[PDB]
Ligand binder design. Structure first.
Ligand code: NI
Ligand SMILES: [Zn+2]
Ligand SMILES: [Zn+2]
Ligand SMILES: [Zn+2]
Ligand SMILES: [Zn+2]
Lengths: 62, 64
């Protein structure tokens, strides 16, 4: 409910779901999930969230 | 950015389509990688409205 806690929550959402250090920076084609930072995207050939095979790793910019 | 409040506001707003600001980004542009528009707003553009790079694909993304 508090501002700080809402904030902590959104920050935590932005984090790579594999290393949880760096922010997400890659979108998986073709499933379209935002899952990993750039480094961690080197370790995966299938989306961790939906297991779709990744045909391409697009770099993103907000 | 200068207070927890503005930090919150920014993280909340950056989810929003940058054109209409009425709904979440739902498209990433290939090849530039800009996250700019909801599905509706991406319909009209053939170049990214941020960097003007020709768009070869509008990839749907899941952002909540
Ligand atoms: Ni509005
Ligand atoms: Zn990572
Ligand atoms: Zn996926
Ligand atoms: Zn829009
Ligand atoms: Zn662009």
């Amino acid at each position: 409910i508090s501002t700080e806690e809402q904030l902590r929550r959104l920050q935590e959402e932005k984090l790579c779901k594999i290393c949880m250090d760096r922010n997400i920076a890659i979108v998986f084609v073709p499933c379209g999930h935002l899952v990993t930072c750039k480094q961690c995207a080197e370790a995966v050939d299938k989306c961790p969230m939906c297991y779709t095979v990744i045909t391409f790793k697009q770099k993103i910019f907000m």
